[PDB]
Write a protein that binds this ligand. Structure first.
Ligand code: ACO
Ligand code: ACO
Ligand code: F5U
Ligand code: F5U
Lengths: 146, 149
Protein backbone atom coordinates (compact mmCIF):
# COMPACT_ATOMS: atom_id res chain seq x y z
CA UNK A 1 0.00 0.00 0.00
CA UNK A 2 2.63 2.44 0.96
CA UNK A 3 6.06 2.46 -0.61
CA UNK A 4 9.10 4.76 -0.96
CA UNK A 5 9.82 5.21 -4.65
CA UNK A 6 13.02 7.14 -4.51
CA UNK A 7 15.08 9.40 -2.28
CA UNK A 8 17.07 12.43 -3.31
CA UNK A 9 18.98 15.24 -1.55
CA UNK A 10 19.91 18.96 -1.87
CA UNK A 11 12.91 14.30 -0.17
CA UNK A 12 11.38 10.98 -0.73
CA UNK A 13 8.62 10.06 -3.13
CA UNK A 14 5.95 7.87 -1.63
CA UNK A 15 3.42 5.84 -3.50
CA UNK A 16 0.20 4.89 -1.89
CA UNK A 17 -2.98 2.92 -2.63
CA UNK A 18 -4.88 4.26 0.39
CA UNK A 19 -6.61 7.14 -1.35
CA UNK A 20 -5.81 9.66 1.39
CA UNK A 21 -6.17 12.48 -1.14
CA UNK A 22 -7.47 15.77 0.19
CA UNK A 23 -9.56 17.41 -2.51
CA UNK A 24 -7.97 20.81 -1.89
CA UNK A 25 -4.47 19.47 -2.56
CA UNK A 26 -5.70 17.76 -5.71
CA UNK A 27 -7.38 20.95 -6.91
CA UNK A 28 -3.95 22.62 -6.66
CA UNK A 29 -2.31 19.82 -8.56
CA UNK A 30 -4.94 20.00 -11.20
CA UNK A 31 -4.53 23.73 -11.56
CA UNK A 32 -0.81 23.46 -12.19
CA UNK A 33 -1.54 21.32 -15.26
CA UNK A 34 -4.25 23.74 -16.32
CA UNK A 35 -7.22 21.48 -15.72
CA UNK A 36 -10.47 23.38 -15.05
CA UNK A 37 -11.83 23.78 -11.53
CA UNK A 38 -14.68 21.44 -10.65
CA UNK A 39 -16.94 21.36 -7.57
CA UNK A 40 -14.96 19.93 -4.67
CA UNK A 41 -17.96 17.88 -3.53
CA UNK A 42 -18.09 16.32 -7.01
CA UNK A 43 -14.34 15.64 -7.01
CA UNK A 44 -14.82 14.13 -3.56
CA UNK A 45 -17.75 12.08 -4.85
CA UNK A 46 -15.60 10.75 -7.70
CA UNK A 47 -12.72 9.82 -5.40
CA UNK A 48 -15.07 8.10 -2.97
CA UNK A 49 -16.46 6.07 -5.92
CA UNK A 50 -13.09 5.17 -7.50
CA UNK A 51 -12.16 1.52 -7.10
CA UNK A 52 -8.50 2.60 -6.97
CA UNK A 53 -6.97 5.92 -5.97
CA UNK A 54 -3.17 6.08 -6.26
CA UNK A 55 -0.96 8.92 -5.07
CA UNK A 56 2.57 10.29 -5.22
CA UNK A 57 3.68 12.26 -2.15
CA UNK A 58 6.93 14.14 -1.61
CA UNK A 59 7.56 14.14 2.12
CA UNK A 60 10.29 16.46 3.19
CA UNK A 61 3.83 15.64 2.63
CA UNK A 62 2.99 17.19 -0.76
CA UNK A 63 0.74 15.60 -3.34
CA UNK A 64 2.59 15.45 -6.65
CA UNK A 65 0.98 12.55 -8.45
CA UNK A 66 -2.33 10.82 -8.79
CA UNK A 67 -4.08 8.18 -10.84
CA UNK A 68 -7.46 6.63 -10.27
CA UNK A 69 -9.58 3.90 -11.78
CA UNK A 70 -13.20 2.93 -11.76
CA UNK A 71 -13.91 -0.75 -11.92
CA UNK A 72 -16.70 -3.26 -11.69
CA UNK A 73 -14.54 -5.05 -9.05
CA UNK A 74 -14.38 -8.17 -11.21
CA UNK A 75 -13.65 -7.84 -14.95
CA UNK A 76 -13.02 -4.27 -16.09
CA UNK A 77 -11.08 -1.25 -14.88
CA UNK A 78 -10.79 2.14 -16.54
CA UNK A 79 -8.05 4.62 -15.62
CA UNK A 80 -9.02 8.29 -15.46
CA UNK A 81 -7.04 11.37 -14.47
CA UNK A 82 -3.36 10.51 -14.14
CA UNK A 83 -1.21 13.57 -13.58
CA UNK A 84 2.21 14.46 -12.22
CA UNK A 85 3.17 17.89 -10.86
CA UNK A 86 4.91 19.71 -13.73
CA UNK A 87 8.02 20.41 -11.58
CA UNK A 88 8.36 16.60 -11.31
CA UNK A 89 7.74 15.28 -14.82
CA UNK A 90 10.49 13.71 -16.89
CA UNK A 91 11.84 11.96 -13.84
CA UNK A 92 10.30 8.60 -14.48
CA UNK A 93 7.47 9.17 -11.95
CA UNK A 94 4.49 8.89 -14.31
CA UNK A 95 5.89 5.56 -15.30
CA UNK A 96 6.35 4.34 -11.78
CA UNK A 97 2.85 5.48 -10.76
CA UNK A 98 1.23 3.71 -13.72
CA UNK A 99 3.32 0.60 -13.15
CA UNK A 100 2.02 0.17 -9.64
CA UNK A 101 -1.48 0.99 -10.78
CA UNK A 102 -1.45 -1.84 -13.34
CA UNK A 103 0.16 -4.20 -10.84
CA UNK A 104 -2.42 -3.37 -8.13
CA UNK A 105 -5.29 -3.97 -10.55
CA UNK A 106 -3.71 -7.22 -11.77
CA UNK A 107 -3.37 -8.34 -8.13
CA UNK A 108 -7.05 -7.62 -7.46
CA UNK A 109 -7.72 -9.90 -10.48
CA UNK A 110 -8.96 -7.25 -12.94
CA UNK A 111 -7.86 -8.51 -16.34
CA UNK A 112 -9.37 -5.74 -18.52
CA UNK A 113 -7.41 -2.54 -17.88
CA UNK A 114 -8.45 0.31 -20.14
CA UNK A 115 -8.08 4.07 -20.52
CA UNK A 116 -8.83 6.94 -22.89
CA UNK A 117 -5.69 8.75 -24.03
CA UNK A 118 -5.36 12.19 -25.53
CA UNK A 119 -3.38 12.48 -28.78
CA UNK A 120 -0.16 13.73 -27.23
CA UNK A 121 -0.14 11.05 -24.48
CA UNK A 122 -0.90 7.88 -26.50
CA UNK A 123 2.80 7.13 -26.91
CA UNK A 124 3.45 7.26 -23.15
CA UNK A 125 0.85 4.53 -22.65
CA UNK A 126 1.94 2.43 -25.63
CA UNK A 127 5.31 2.20 -23.91
CA UNK A 128 3.81 0.88 -20.68
CA UNK A 129 2.06 -1.87 -22.66
CA UNK A 130 -1.25 -0.29 -23.65
CA UNK A 131 -2.43 -0.95 -27.18
CA UNK A 132 -4.83 1.28 -29.12
CA UNK A 133 -7.83 -0.16 -31.06
CA UNK A 134 -6.87 -3.84 -30.68
CA UNK A 135 -8.62 -5.82 -33.40
CA UNK A 136 -10.53 -2.70 -34.46
CA UNK A 137 -12.25 -2.01 -31.12
CA UNK A 138 -12.97 1.68 -30.80
CA UNK A 139 -13.46 3.92 -27.80
CA UNK A 140 -16.53 6.11 -28.22
CA UNK A 141 -18.11 9.12 -26.45
CA UNK A 142 -21.72 10.30 -26.52
CA UNK A 143 -21.64 13.79 -28.10
CA UNK A 144 -18.26 14.91 -26.73
CA UNK A 145 -17.29 18.53 -26.09
CA UNK A 146 -13.51 18.51 -25.99
CA UNK B 1 -38.09 12.29 -15.52
CA UNK B 2 -38.00 8.68 -16.65
CA UNK B 3 -39.29 6.11 -14.16
CA UNK B 4 -37.29 3.22 -12.78
CA UNK B 5 -39.41 0.62 -14.59
CA UNK B 6 -41.73 1.10 -17.57
CA UNK B 7 -43.38 -0.83 -20.41
CA UNK B 8 -41.75 -0.46 -23.83
CA UNK B 9 -44.04 -2.42 -26.12
CA UNK B 10 -47.16 -4.54 -26.41
CA UNK B 11 -47.68 -7.38 -28.77
CA UNK B 12 -49.51 -10.66 -28.74
CA UNK B 13 -49.37 -14.25 -29.95
CA UNK B 14 -46.32 -10.17 -24.07
CA UNK B 15 -45.14 -6.80 -23.01
CA UNK B 16 -41.49 -5.75 -22.93
CA UNK B 17 -40.52 -3.79 -19.80
CA UNK B 18 -37.36 -1.76 -19.28
CA UNK B 19 -35.98 -1.31 -15.80
CA UNK B 20 -33.01 0.32 -14.13
CA UNK B 21 -33.87 -1.40 -10.84
CA UNK B 22 -30.91 -3.71 -11.36
CA UNK B 23 -32.40 -6.84 -10.10
CA UNK B 24 -31.12 -9.29 -12.60
CA UNK B 25 -30.65 -12.90 -11.59
CA UNK B 26 -27.13 -14.01 -12.37
CA UNK B 27 -28.50 -17.32 -13.56
CA UNK B 28 -30.83 -15.81 -16.15
CA UNK B 29 -28.00 -13.49 -17.22
CA UNK B 30 -25.62 -16.44 -17.58
CA UNK B 31 -28.13 -18.03 -19.97
CA UNK B 32 -28.53 -14.85 -22.04
CA UNK B 33 -24.73 -14.68 -22.31
CA UNK B 34 -24.70 -18.29 -23.56
CA UNK B 35 -27.13 -17.42 -26.35
CA UNK B 36 -25.01 -14.58 -27.77
CA UNK B 37 -22.03 -16.97 -27.68
CA UNK B 38 -20.28 -15.59 -24.64
CA UNK B 39 -18.09 -17.88 -22.52
CA UNK B 40 -19.33 -18.48 -19.02
CA UNK B 41 -17.89 -16.63 -16.10
CA UNK B 42 -17.87 -17.44 -12.36
CA UNK B 43 -21.27 -16.65 -10.88
CA UNK B 44 -19.75 -15.07 -7.79
CA UNK B 45 -17.73 -12.74 -10.02
CA UNK B 46 -20.70 -11.90 -12.28
CA UNK B 47 -22.56 -11.26 -9.02
CA UNK B 48 -19.68 -8.98 -7.99
CA UNK B 49 -19.68 -7.05 -11.29
CA UNK B 50 -23.45 -6.41 -11.22
CA UNK B 51 -23.20 -5.39 -7.56
CA UNK B 52 -20.44 -2.92 -8.45
CA UNK B 53 -22.14 -1.49 -11.56
CA UNK B 54 -23.54 2.01 -11.17
CA UNK B 55 -26.33 1.28 -13.66
CA UNK B 56 -27.84 -2.11 -14.49
CA UNK B 57 -30.66 -1.95 -17.06
CA UNK B 58 -32.80 -4.87 -18.16
CA UNK B 59 -35.27 -5.94 -20.83
CA UNK B 60 -37.74 -8.65 -19.73
CA UNK B 61 -40.47 -10.51 -21.63
CA UNK B 62 -43.51 -10.62 -19.34
CA UNK B 63 -46.34 -12.98 -20.22
CA UNK B 64 -40.37 -12.73 -16.58
CA UNK B 65 -37.73 -13.63 -19.22
CA UNK B 66 -34.51 -11.64 -19.42
CA UNK B 67 -34.04 -10.64 -23.04
CA UNK B 68 -31.85 -7.57 -22.83
CA UNK B 69 -29.22 -6.07 -20.63
CA UNK B 70 -26.79 -3.20 -20.48
CA UNK B 71 -24.69 -2.03 -17.57
CA UNK B 72 -22.32 0.81 -16.80
CA UNK B 73 -19.71 1.60 -14.24
CA UNK B 74 -19.25 5.22 -13.16
CA UNK B 75 -17.53 7.42 -10.62
CA UNK B 76 -21.00 8.92 -9.71
CA UNK B 77 -19.94 12.42 -10.80
CA UNK B 78 -18.00 12.68 -14.08
CA UNK B 79 -17.48 9.56 -16.19
CA UNK B 80 -19.40 6.43 -17.07
CA UNK B 81 -18.48 3.43 -19.22
CA UNK B 82 -21.03 1.04 -20.70
CA UNK B 83 -20.17 -2.68 -20.77
CA UNK B 84 -22.03 -5.81 -21.87
CA UNK B 85 -24.77 -4.36 -24.04
CA UNK B 86 -26.56 -7.50 -25.23
CA UNK B 87 -29.98 -8.65 -26.44
CA UNK B 88 -31.40 -12.18 -26.79
CA UNK B 89 -30.87 -13.12 -30.47
CA UNK B 90 -34.55 -14.09 -30.90
CA UNK B 91 -35.48 -10.44 -30.14
CA UNK B 92 -32.68 -8.69 -32.05
CA UNK B 93 -33.44 -6.55 -35.08
CA UNK B 94 -36.60 -5.24 -33.37
CA UNK B 95 -35.34 -1.88 -32.15
CA UNK B 96 -34.89 -3.24 -28.64
CA UNK B 97 -31.15 -2.64 -28.44
CA UNK B 98 -31.73 0.89 -29.71
CA UNK B 99 -34.53 1.34 -27.16
CA UNK B 100 -32.39 -0.07 -24.36
CA UNK B 101 -29.46 2.24 -25.10
CA UNK B 102 -31.60 5.41 -25.31
CA UNK B 103 -32.92 4.81 -21.79
CA UNK B 104 -29.41 4.09 -20.51
CA UNK B 105 -28.15 7.41 -21.91
CA UNK B 106 -31.17 9.27 -20.53
CA UNK B 107 -30.75 7.72 -17.05
CA UNK B 108 -27.05 8.59 -17.05
CA UNK B 109 -27.94 12.09 -18.19
CA UNK B 110 -30.58 12.49 -15.44
CA UNK B 111 -28.03 11.39 -12.82
CA UNK B 112 -25.97 14.21 -14.40
CA UNK B 113 -23.06 12.11 -15.62
CA UNK B 114 -21.89 14.08 -18.65
CA UNK B 115 -18.99 11.90 -19.90
CA UNK B 116 -20.53 8.69 -21.32
CA UNK B 117 -18.10 6.24 -22.90
CA UNK B 118 -17.86 2.69 -24.23
CA UNK B 119 -15.59 0.33 -26.15
CA UNK B 120 -17.04 -1.03 -29.40
CA UNK B 121 -16.25 -4.17 -31.37
CA UNK B 122 -15.64 -3.29 -35.02
CA UNK B 123 -18.94 -4.86 -36.08
CA UNK B 124 -21.02 -2.79 -33.64
CA UNK B 125 -19.34 0.62 -34.13
CA UNK B 126 -21.97 1.83 -36.63
CA UNK B 127 -24.76 0.82 -34.22
CA UNK B 128 -23.39 3.17 -31.55
CA UNK B 129 -22.59 5.88 -34.13
CA UNK B 130 -26.33 5.91 -34.93
CA UNK B 131 -27.02 6.75 -31.29
CA UNK B 132 -24.76 9.77 -31.09
CA UNK B 133 -21.54 8.11 -29.97
CA UNK B 134 -18.45 9.45 -31.74
CA UNK B 135 -15.24 7.40 -32.12
CA UNK B 136 -11.83 8.90 -31.32
CA UNK B 137 -12.93 12.54 -30.90
CA UNK B 138 -9.90 14.84 -31.18
CA UNK B 139 -7.53 11.99 -31.51
CA UNK B 140 -8.44 10.44 -28.16
CA UNK B 141 -7.70 6.71 -28.35
CA UNK B 142 -9.27 3.92 -26.32
CA UNK B 143 -6.41 1.75 -25.05
CA UNK B 144 -6.09 -1.69 -23.42
CA UNK B 145 -3.19 -3.14 -21.45
CA UNK B 146 -1.84 -6.18 -23.33
CA UNK B 147 -5.12 -7.35 -24.78
CA UNK B 148 -5.59 -10.99 -25.38
CA UNK B 149 -8.17 -10.43 -28.02
C1 ACO C 1 -5.30 10.54 -18.04
C2 ACO C 1 -5.68 10.45 -19.48
O1 ACO C 1 -6.68 9.84 -19.81
S1 ACO C 1 -4.70 11.21 -20.58
C3 ACO C 1 -3.30 11.38 -19.53
C4 ACO C 1 -3.40 12.58 -18.63
N1 ACO C 1 -2.12 13.16 -18.29
C5 ACO C 1 -1.78 14.42 -18.53
O2 ACO C 1 -1.47 14.81 -19.60
C6 ACO C 1 -1.76 15.43 -17.44
C7 ACO C 1 -0.36 15.96 -17.29
N2 ACO C 1 0.61 14.95 -17.57
C8 ACO C 1 1.46 14.48 -16.69
O3 ACO C 1 1.25 14.60 -15.53
C9 ACO C 1 2.69 13.84 -17.22
O4 ACO C 1 3.06 14.48 -18.41
C10 ACO C 1 2.52 12.38 -17.56
C11 ACO C 1 1.72 11.70 -16.51
C12 ACO C 1 1.83 12.21 -18.87
C13 ACO C 1 3.89 11.76 -17.66
O5 ACO C 1 4.67 12.16 -16.57
P1 ACO C 1 6.20 12.18 -16.62
O6 ACO C 1 6.73 12.13 -15.28
O7 ACO C 1 6.48 13.23 -17.54
O8 ACO C 1 6.55 10.82 -17.26
P2 ACO C 1 7.76 10.01 -16.78
O9 ACO C 1 8.74 10.92 -16.33
O10 ACO C 1 7.40 8.89 -15.96
O11 ACO C 1 8.22 9.44 -18.12
C14 ACO C 1 7.91 8.11 -18.42
C15 ACO C 1 8.37 7.62 -19.77
O12 ACO C 1 7.50 8.05 -20.78
C16 ACO C 1 8.11 9.01 -21.60
N3 ACO C 1 7.19 10.13 -21.78
C17 ACO C 1 6.94 11.11 -20.93
N4 ACO C 1 6.03 11.95 -21.42
C18 ACO C 1 5.71 11.49 -22.61
C19 ACO C 1 4.81 11.89 -23.66
N5 ACO C 1 4.05 12.98 -23.54
N6 ACO C 1 4.78 11.14 -24.74
C20 ACO C 1 5.54 10.08 -24.86
N7 ACO C 1 6.36 9.65 -23.93
C21 ACO C 1 6.48 10.30 -22.82
C22 ACO C 1 9.30 9.44 -20.85
O13 ACO C 1 10.24 9.80 -21.81
C23 ACO C 1 9.69 8.16 -20.19
O14 ACO C 1 10.24 7.26 -21.13
P3 ACO C 1 11.40 6.27 -20.78
O15 ACO C 1 11.12 5.67 -19.48
O16 ACO C 1 11.25 5.32 -21.89
O17 ACO C 1 12.57 7.13 -20.77
C1 ACO D 1 -21.24 -4.47 -25.48
C2 ACO D 1 -20.23 -3.56 -26.08
O1 ACO D 1 -19.78 -2.65 -25.41
S1 ACO D 1 -19.79 -3.84 -27.66
C3 ACO D 1 -21.37 -4.41 -28.12
C4 ACO D 1 -21.44 -5.92 -27.93
N1 ACO D 1 -22.72 -6.51 -28.21
C5 ACO D 1 -22.80 -7.73 -28.73
O2 ACO D 1 -22.02 -8.12 -29.55
C6 ACO D 1 -23.90 -8.64 -28.26
C7 ACO D 1 -24.62 -9.23 -29.43
N2 ACO D 1 -25.20 -8.17 -30.20
C8 ACO D 1 -26.30 -7.58 -29.81
O3 ACO D 1 -26.65 -7.69 -28.69
C9 ACO D 1 -27.12 -6.82 -30.79
O4 ACO D 1 -26.54 -6.89 -32.07
C10 ACO D 1 -27.19 -5.36 -30.45
C11 ACO D 1 -27.55 -5.17 -29.01
C12 ACO D 1 -25.87 -4.71 -30.75
C13 ACO D 1 -28.26 -4.73 -31.29
O5 ACO D 1 -29.50 -5.17 -30.84
P1 ACO D 1 -30.65 -5.13 -31.83
O6 ACO D 1 -31.86 -5.28 -31.07
O7 ACO D 1 -30.28 -6.07 -32.85
O8 ACO D 1 -30.60 -3.69 -32.40
P2 ACO D 1 -31.82 -2.81 -32.81
O9 ACO D 1 -32.87 -3.60 -33.33
O10 ACO D 1 -32.17 -1.85 -31.83
O11 ACO D 1 -31.21 -2.15 -34.02
C14 ACO D 1 -31.29 -0.77 -34.13
C15 ACO D 1 -30.73 -0.24 -35.44
O12 ACO D 1 -29.34 -0.39 -35.46
C16 ACO D 1 -28.97 -1.16 -36.57
N3 ACO D 1 -27.99 -2.19 -36.27
C17 ACO D 1 -28.22 -3.39 -35.74
N4 ACO D 1 -27.11 -4.14 -35.64
C18 ACO D 1 -26.16 -3.39 -36.15
C19 ACO D 1 -24.75 -3.54 -36.35
N5 ACO D 1 -24.13 -4.66 -35.99
N6 ACO D 1 -24.10 -2.53 -36.90
C20 ACO D 1 -24.71 -1.40 -37.27
N7 ACO D 1 -26.00 -1.19 -37.11
C21 ACO D 1 -26.74 -2.13 -36.56
C22 ACO D 1 -30.19 -1.92 -36.96
O13 ACO D 1 -30.14 -2.27 -38.32
C23 ACO D 1 -31.28 -0.96 -36.64
O14 ACO D 1 -31.46 -0.07 -37.73
P3 ACO D 1 -32.36 1.20 -37.57
O15 ACO D 1 -31.40 2.31 -37.65
O16 ACO D 1 -33.31 1.05 -38.67
O17 ACO D 1 -33.00 1.01 -36.28
C1 F5U E 1 -13.31 13.86 -18.54
O1 F5U E 1 -12.14 13.13 -18.40
C2 F5U E 1 -11.51 12.74 -19.58
C3 F5U E 1 -11.58 11.60 -20.35
C4 F5U E 1 -10.82 11.46 -21.48
C5 F5U E 1 -9.98 12.50 -21.85
N1 F5U E 1 -9.13 12.64 -22.90
C6 F5U E 1 -8.53 13.84 -22.82
C7 F5U E 1 -9.00 14.47 -21.71
C8 F5U E 1 -8.38 15.85 -21.55
C9 F5U E 1 -7.44 15.85 -20.38
N2 F5U E 1 -6.18 15.24 -20.75
C10 F5U E 1 -9.90 13.64 -21.11
C11 F5U E 1 -10.67 13.76 -19.95
C1 F5U F 1 -13.07 -12.40 -25.12
O1 F5U F 1 -12.87 -11.95 -23.80
C2 F5U F 1 -13.53 -10.78 -23.41
C3 F5U F 1 -13.16 -9.60 -22.76
C4 F5U F 1 -14.11 -8.62 -22.54
C5 F5U F 1 -15.44 -8.80 -22.97
N1 F5U F 1 -16.59 -8.07 -22.91
C6 F5U F 1 -17.60 -8.77 -23.48
C7 F5U F 1 -17.06 -9.95 -23.89
C8 F5U F 1 -17.97 -10.91 -24.60
C9 F5U F 1 -17.42 -11.02 -26.01
N2 F5U F 1 -17.41 -9.71 -26.61
C10 F5U F 1 -15.76 -9.95 -23.59
C11 F5U F 1 -14.82 -10.94 -23.81
Amino acid sequence: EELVLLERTLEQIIFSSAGDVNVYDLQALCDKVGWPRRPLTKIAASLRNSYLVATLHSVTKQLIGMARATSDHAFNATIWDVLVDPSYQGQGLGKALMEKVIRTLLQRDISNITLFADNKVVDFYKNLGFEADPQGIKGMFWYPRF
